[PDB]
Amino acid sequence: IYQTSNFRVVPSGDVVRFPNITNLCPFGEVFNATKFPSVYAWERKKISNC
Amino acid sequence: IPTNFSISITTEVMPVSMAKTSVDCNMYICGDSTECANLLLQYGSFCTQ
């Protein structure tokens, strides 16, 4: 018996994980709110960087 | 001159073998990096020795 080289198992797949929310968008706060303006006096939003 | 006898038994511990160790220098040094192994190959065949 003569030692010749070393064997290695080449990885086939790949696993990448990410955190839960990472500053989730406040869409949920605007969707299910408590006060909603009328149709003639509707108010928009400026949701950005979410 | 002795007049009787005394059959005694003694012990003696002597090592005859040790731990058969085997260290893979390809995994000890440069575990999974490719450029690390490329630079290690420049130093010669020390791992084979």
Residues in A touching B27 (Cβ below 8 Å): 6
B12-48 burial by CB neighbour count: b if 16+ within 10 A, else e? eeeeeeeeeeeeeeeeeebeeeeeeeeebeeeeeebe
**Which candidate in B23, B25, B26, B40 is best for mutational testing of the A interface (most A CBs within 10 A)?**
B26
CA gap B39, A31 in Å, rounded: 58
**Which candidate in A1, A2, A8 is best for mutational testing of the B interface (most B CBs within 10 A)?**
A8
How do the residues of chain B divide into helix, strand and coil, expressed in percent and rounded to 5?
30, 0, 70
Task: Name the resolution in angstroms.
Answer: 2.9
Cα distances (Å, whole numbers) of residue A32 to A21, A26, A28, A40: 19, 11, 6, 21
* DSSP symbol at A9: P
Residues in A touching B26 (Cβ below 8 Å): 6, 8
Solving technique for this entry? cryo-EM
